[PDB]
Write a protein that binds this ligand. Structure first.
Ligand SMILES: [K+]
Ligand SMILES: [K+]
Ligand SMILES: [K+]
Ligand SMILES: [K+]
Ligand SMILES: [Mg+2]
Ligand SMILES: [Mg+2]
Ligand SMILES: [Mg+2]
Ligand SMILES: [Mg+2]
Ligand SMILES: [Mg+2]
Ligand SMILES: [Mg+2]
Ligand SMILES: [Mg+2]
Ligand SMILES: [Mg+2]
Ligand SMILES: [Mg+2]
Ligand SMILES: [Mg+2]
Ligand SMILES: [Mg+2]
Ligand SMILES: [Mg+2]
Ligand SMILES: [Mg+2]
Ligand SMILES: [Mg+2]
Ligand SMILES: [Mg+2]
Ligand SMILES: [Mg+2]
Ligand SMILES: [Mg+2]
Ligand SMILES: [Mg+2]
Ligand SMILES: [Mg+2]
Ligand SMILES: [Mg+2]
Ligand SMILES: [Mg+2]
Ligand SMILES: [Mg+2]
Ligand SMILES: [Mg+2]
Ligand SMILES: [Mg+2]
Ligand SMILES: [Mg+2]
Ligand SMILES: [Mg+2]
Ligand SMILES: [Mg+2]
Ligand SMILES: [Mg+2]
Ligand SMILES: [Mg+2]
Ligand SMILES: [Mg+2]
Ligand SMILES: [Mg+2]
Ligand SMILES: [Mg+2]
Ligand SMILES: [Mg+2]
Ligand SMILES: [Mg+2]
Lengths: 172, 129, 132, 6, 312, 208
RNA sequence: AAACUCCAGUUGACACAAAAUAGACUACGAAAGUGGCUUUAACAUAUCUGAACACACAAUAGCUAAGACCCAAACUGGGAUUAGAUACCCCACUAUGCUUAGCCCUAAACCUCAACAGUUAAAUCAACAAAACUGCUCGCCAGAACACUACGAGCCACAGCUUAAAACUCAAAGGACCUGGCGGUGCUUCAUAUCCCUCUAGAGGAGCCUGUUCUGUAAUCGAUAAACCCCGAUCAACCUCACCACCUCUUGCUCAGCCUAUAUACCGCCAUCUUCAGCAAACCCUGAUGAAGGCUACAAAGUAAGCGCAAGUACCCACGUAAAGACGUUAGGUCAAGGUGUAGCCCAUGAGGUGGCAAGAAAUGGGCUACAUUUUCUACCCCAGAAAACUACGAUAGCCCUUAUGAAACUUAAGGGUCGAAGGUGGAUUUAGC
RNA sequence: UUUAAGAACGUGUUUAUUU
């Protein structure tokens, strides 16, 4: 919203946002369906899925948007240019292009089974295809040709030292 | 402009509307201001020519998708059907084809209008007795 | 730029009256005169005393009817009489209007040595000609 | 303007 | 905004107030036209304001309130016109009708009149129009006339034409009068600057002119002034045939001559042919000269001159 | 002006209206019909339909007037015409039999010819080129040279060289000289023609 | 201008210099670079990448030696321009540009876009530019400046090249854009008393009137490029009056007062662009939802209240002149019209009385009257008579006297007498008028 | 392709009924 007086700019932006609403899909109504990693212009956003109770550990703006959407638990790291307008335009972009468990099953005609450490080896079926279930399995891949992120690999190997990560903060 | 008269007549015959003239900005997105706050926008738009006079998509194709209005369009080999809901690939230049499209849409609409009057008359007649 | 008796344009939220919305170059074309007497006519006299009486009356009535006047006064002189015509609001109680009519009519008769009469016309709210 | 000269 | 119900209540107050106003003035409420209302409102509420649109007025609500378009959709919400979503259903329905009559002609095969102006076309259509829109519609109408239009077409085109009152630039002849003796003459008046002259021109004379009871050559010593008196009669070849007796007042030396020249010429138009009167008009002998002294302005030395300007 | 653009200038010509309809051309006939509809200005006091009216002498009189005193300017004009007339009669009676056939006594014919012998064919215009001014020869229009002849004649007489000599006697003397292609006014015209010939090469500086 | 004038023009003879057109072609070479003709020799590698530990090349300029010399030409000289001109313009001439044998090894050496292989689909994609990417490899860069620097080392290089830091200092530097302004910025169309040319009368010279600046005085204030300067003042002998000196009063004409400071705190009333036509609420859309932007009528995203212009109205109309003229610009003018925020005085920064200054060495603005013959005086109000250069034209100046107003006049005004000055139509420059 | 044409001190210009 733009205007000369600040009270007039709040109205234009507020009344015009309800006409450009998105719908964000949520996994169990508390987090996203999968890890997201995109780049809107120069701003990188790498969101991760987390279980219940993890809370929101992300940029303060993302904390304020997520509460509006209804996402209680998720981690996000912003890199590149911290521009509030590219950060916001990219957040809504990746949260709308995320594939749910039902679309995935229908796409490949296979069962989507959830494996949890708390529930042991019990296979939990979260989604199944509505159409004909395929009889052949996916070809097991010896080594996957997937691009990795040095930041995540460096943390899993106990090498990312930082006196600012995993700090005790207030509830979000 | 070659088929502006033909289309305006068909809309009048089938009790429908037509807009063959220069499309002023905001007829759909800013309608309440142009017409009035209690105006009712179309429920279906039919494009007999999806291009304007400069060989570019008509602005209503994008403005209709903004207002959540389904569109029917006659797309030729130099048109964009990405935002057209029900596209019909066919010639949109020769007069022998435009007369057909108008004759088909004028008939399908006239039938449905008369088909509901028969369904209602039966329901009303059956309801009383 | 000229400033006399002009209400400057604003965003559009300011209400003005008919007399307050026209500038001095309309005083005999679209407005009249708020005072009517013979002092300023050719060959007449005592135009200076009639002006001091007018200036005092507009202030006496502004402070005697505080927050009640909807528009400027209209003073009229027919010979010895002096007729004050005012447009007032309806917030005040009629009991208090009749008190002030008799108090002002009397006080002004003994001050200016002339029979004075006051005519009120109540309106619900200040009339608005347009919004500037 | 340039300062005045003595 | 003013609704139809509001207008209907204003029609009832005017009708009742029209019967009161006739009871005040002592007239017959039945035969009380709108001309009598305007005369009674100017007596009861006398206002000398120079603007006539700012004076008290008691007219019919159909002439006070501006015409407004009717509602264009019903309860269900469907508009009543098929060209509604254009925003100019009235302007385009007209262009659609005219262009439909131009197709029929192809198949089976002004002095007083002026094309409707833009502001007068908006009232007919009750629609706001641009300039270029007005020109497009006028081009179709003209194209309609060139073709062999039928009788029904002419009636249509005449709805968008307005008659014009053509003025006549023909001098008005004065009535020839007769005196006690029986001599024919004609009287007229002239005006130059502040000079005002009344001239009496006799039909038959020996070329004698008397200004204020004095012979012309004595009253106008300057030759230029006498040349002016000679111009009207010389132009029509009537020198030494009429006797003039005029009286001029005000003005100066040369303004009194020009004022007399004009009066003599106007009065001389009764004893000449129409073709000659037209020639006098095309020569500038029957036209009052509007050139008068211009006023001085404050902050100036004269009417147009300015004070000396100093850049520094 | 207090006249509107619709108003047209009047035609004081008296022999124009008398023209028969048979002589009127298709274009001229149309013109006459048009004027009936148009509005016409009021004829000014300067010009009448007289037979002695001379527009050239009326303009020269206006160029001598000072402060709106037309009575005095016209007085000086007629005195000059009378002085030129008397000087020729005195030179006509004292002339020989065959010398009286080449002596013009009409003052008007002398006034028009004297001014025509003073009209310059070409003039000069200061054209700014390279931070300098140049006197570039230029063809003068028909009006310009008619105005210059009058202005030079009036300026010479108004000169201070003449001491206690009245204008009618000064102007009359110049008109005779100019009529004979003599005097300073003619020299002024020749000087202009000599400065244009020396600056002939500068003609290319002109663009129009 | 200088220079040349054993110069110029026609014709003929005549190069160790430079290579029109073709070329609207886009080829050769590692790059540099290569465009007149002929001939000889001749343009690496059957995978790719790869040497800043080496080798061989490398425009122009420049160094060394020996030659050639049409033309061009740093340097230099002369001419001109300029406040100066060690430059831009003109002339002349040299190193140098060419050949031969060696050296020097630099460039915006930039197509600022590495080599090989491969792709056009997905998120195409900050912006601009020449669309966005994958695999592999080498080289290179890590805030600006210090720094194409110092030291060290190497080199036929000795005022050189290559490699290349540090201390102190800063909180920015930088790249690409939006809007506006400006341009001794282009094209096109124009200005109407306006830009030039072109018309008419004036100012700048003299005297006088009047204002201002300086100077002066114990002795106001304010305006003071356009947009001050007969401006606040449609007006100062006392009064007015706020100034100076002296004297005097203290709850004071006022439920006090202050013409004390601040117009850069304001209301109020105005100047100015305006001799303009735009300002803009509320919505919509575009730009990937950036600062911002929003038009084409055979129409492509604009709809627009309101203000202004316009329209109406006043004066003698339809003309013209007045009036009107928005938002903003110059912290423009006014606290001394009045009112007023903030600050300050209260035996004084307040109040009253008497008297008094308001001048001119000097410069300048505006205006009046003149320098005369289209004039001067008289009569007349336009058919006259006289005057006309040291007793002419020419002071509204000076001096003297009288009168008017007033309590008060060398002082203000009027008149008379006396006086008869400068001035001989005015330099650069400059105002107004359809 | 078309004369010349220099200069302008330092700071300061945006938020919650009689009787
Ligand atoms: K380059
Ligand atoms: K002068
Ligand atoms: K002077
Ligand atoms: K002066
Ligand atoms: Mg097609
Ligand atoms: Mg003004
Ligand atoms: Mg004048
Ligand atoms: Mg290799
Ligand atoms: Mg290398
Ligand atoms: Mg080299
Ligand atoms: Mg060399
Ligand atoms: Mg040479
Ligand atoms: Mg030199
Ligand atoms: Mg040499
Ligand atoms: Mg060289
Ligand atoms: Mg190169
Ligand atoms: Mg490089
Ligand atoms: Mg390489
Ligand atoms: Mg650095
Ligand atoms: Mg270097
Ligand atoms: Mg070095
Ligand atoms: Mg070293
Ligand atoms: Mg002063
Ligand atoms: Mg000052
Ligand atoms: Mg000041
Ligand atoms: Mg005094
Ligand atoms: Mg005193
Ligand atoms: Mg004081
Ligand atoms: Mg100010
Ligand atoms: Mg004005
Ligand atoms: Mg207006
Ligand atoms: Mg200021
Ligand atoms: Mg002045
Ligand atoms: Mg005297
Ligand atoms: Mg006395
Ligand atoms: Mg004398
Ligand atoms: Mg300097
Ligand atoms: Mg500066």
């Amino acid at each position: 919203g733009k205007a000369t007086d600040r009270m007039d700019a709040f109205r234009k932006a507020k009344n015009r946002a309800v006409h450009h609403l998105h719908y964000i899909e949520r996994y169990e109504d508390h987090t996203i369906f999968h890890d997201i990693s995109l780049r809107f212009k120069r701003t990188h956003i790498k969101m991760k899925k987390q279980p219940k109770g993890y809370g929101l550990r992300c940029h303060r703006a993302i904390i304020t948007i997520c509460r509006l959407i209804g996402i209680k638990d998720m981690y996000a790291k912003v890199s590149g240019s911290i521009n509030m307008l590219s950060l916001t335009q990219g957040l809504f972009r990746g949260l709308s292009r995320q594939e749910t468990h039902q679309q995935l099953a229908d796409k490949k005609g296979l069962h989507v089974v959830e494996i949890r450490e708390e529930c042991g080896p019990l296979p939990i079926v979260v989604a199944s295809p509505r159409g004909p279930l395929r009889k052949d399995p996916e070809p097991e891949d010896e080594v996957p040709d997937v691009k990795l992120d040095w930041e995540d690999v460096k943390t899993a190997q106990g090498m990312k030292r930082s006196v600012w990560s995993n700090l005790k903060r207030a509830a979000t | 402009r070659q088929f502006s008269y033909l289309i305006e007549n068909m809309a009048r015959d089938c009790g429908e509307y037509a807009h063959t003239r220069y499309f002023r900005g905001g007829m759909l997105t800013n309608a309440r201001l142009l017409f009035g706050p209690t105006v009712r926008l179309p429920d279906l738009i039919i494009f007999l020519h999806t291009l304007n006079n400069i060989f570019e998509p008509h602005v209503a194709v994008r403005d209709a998708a903004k207002m959540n209005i389904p569109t029917v369009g006659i797309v030729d080999t130099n048109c964009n059907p990405c935002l057209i809901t029900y596209p019909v690939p066919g010639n949109d230049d020769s007069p022998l084809a435009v007369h057909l499209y108008c004759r088909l849409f004028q008939t399908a609409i006239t039938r449905a209008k008369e088909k509901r009057q028969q369904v209602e008359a039966l329901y009303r007649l059956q309801g009383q007795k | 730029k000229n400033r006399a008796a002009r209400v400057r344009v604003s965003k559009g939220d300011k209400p003005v009256t008919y007399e307050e919305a026209h500038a001095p170059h309309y005083i005999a074309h679209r407005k009249g005169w708020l005072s009517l007497h013979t002092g300023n006519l050719d060959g007449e006299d005592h135009a200076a005393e009639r002006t001091v009486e007018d200036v005092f009356l507009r202030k006496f009535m502004w402070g005697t009817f505080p927050g009640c006047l909807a528009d400027q006064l209209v003073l009229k002189r027919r010979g010895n009489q002096l007729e004050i015509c005012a447009v007032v609001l309806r917030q005040l109680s009629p009991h208090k209007y009749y008190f002030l009519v008799g108090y002002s009519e009397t006080l002004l008769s003994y001050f200016y040595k002339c029979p004075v009469r006051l005519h009120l016309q109540t309106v619900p709210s200040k009339v608005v000609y347009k919004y500037l | 303007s340039e300062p005045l000269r003595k | 905004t003013y609704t139809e119900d509001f207008i209907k209540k204003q029609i009832e107050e005017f009708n009742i107030g029209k019967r009161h106003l006739a009871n005040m003035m002592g007239e017959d409420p039945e035969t009380f036209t709108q001309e009598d209302i305007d005369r009674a409102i100017a007596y009861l509420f006398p206002s000398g304001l120079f603007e006539k649109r700012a004076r008290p007025v008691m007219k019919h609500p159909e002439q006070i309130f501006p015409r407004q378009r009717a509602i264009q959709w019903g309860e269900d919400g469907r508009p009543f016109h098929y060209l509604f979503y254009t925003g100019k259903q009235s302007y385009y329905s007209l262009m659609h009708d005219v262009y439909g009559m131009l197709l029929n002609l192809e198949k089976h095969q002004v002095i007083g009149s002026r094309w409707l102006i833009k502001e007068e076309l908006e009232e007919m259509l009750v629609e706001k129009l641009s300039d270029l829109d007005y020109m497009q519609f006028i081009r179709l109408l003209e194209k309609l006339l060139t073709s062999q239009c039928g009788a029904a077409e002419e009636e249509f085109v005449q709805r968008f034409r307005r008659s014009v009152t053509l003025e006549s630039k023909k001098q008005l002849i004065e009535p020839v009068q007769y005196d006690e003796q029986g001599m024919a003459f004609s009287k007229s008046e002239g005006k130059r600057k502040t000079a005002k002259a009344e001239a009496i021109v006799y039909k038959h004379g020996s070329g004698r002119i008397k200004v204020n009871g004095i012979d012309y050559q004595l009253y106008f010593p300057i030759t230029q002034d006498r040349e002016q008196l000679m111009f009207p009669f010389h132009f029509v070849d009537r020198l030494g045939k009429h006797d003039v007796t005029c009286t001029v007042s005000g003005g100066g030396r040369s303004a009194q001559a020009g004022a007399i020249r004009l009066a003599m010429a106007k009065a001389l138009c009764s004893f000449v042919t129409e073709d000659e009167v037209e020639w006098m008009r095309q020569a500038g002998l029957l036209t009052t000269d509007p050139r008068v002294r211009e006023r001085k302005k404050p902050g100036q030395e004269g009417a147009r001159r300015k004070f000396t300007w100093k850049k520094r | 002006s207090r006249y509107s653009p619709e108003f047209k200038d009047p035609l004081i010509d008296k022999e124009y209206y008398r023209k028969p309809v048979e002589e009127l051309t298709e274009e001229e006939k149309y013109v006459r019909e048009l004027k009936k509809t148009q509005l016409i200005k009021a004829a000014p006091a300067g010009k009448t339909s007289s037979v002695f009216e001379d527009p050239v002498i009326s303009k020269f009189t206006n160029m001598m007037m000072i402060g709106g005193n037309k009575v005095l300017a016209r007085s000086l004009m007629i005195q000059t015409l009378e002085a030129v007339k008397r000087k020729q009669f005195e030179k006509y009676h004292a002339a020989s039999a065959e010398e009286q056939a080449t002596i013009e006594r009409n003052p008007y014919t002398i006034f028009h010819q004297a001014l025509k012998n003073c009209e310059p064919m070409i003039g000069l215009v200061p054209i700014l080129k390279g931070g300098r001014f140049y006197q570039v020869p230029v063809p003068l229009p028909d009006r310009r040279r008619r105005f210059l002849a009058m202005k030079w004649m009036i300026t010479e007489c108004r000169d201070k060289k003449h001491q206690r000599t009245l204008m009618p006697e000064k102007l009359s003397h110049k008109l005779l000289e100019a009529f004979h292609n003599q005097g300073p006014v003619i020299k002024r015209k020749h000087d202009l023609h000599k400065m244009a010939e020396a600056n002939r090469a500068l003609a290319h500086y002109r663009w129009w």
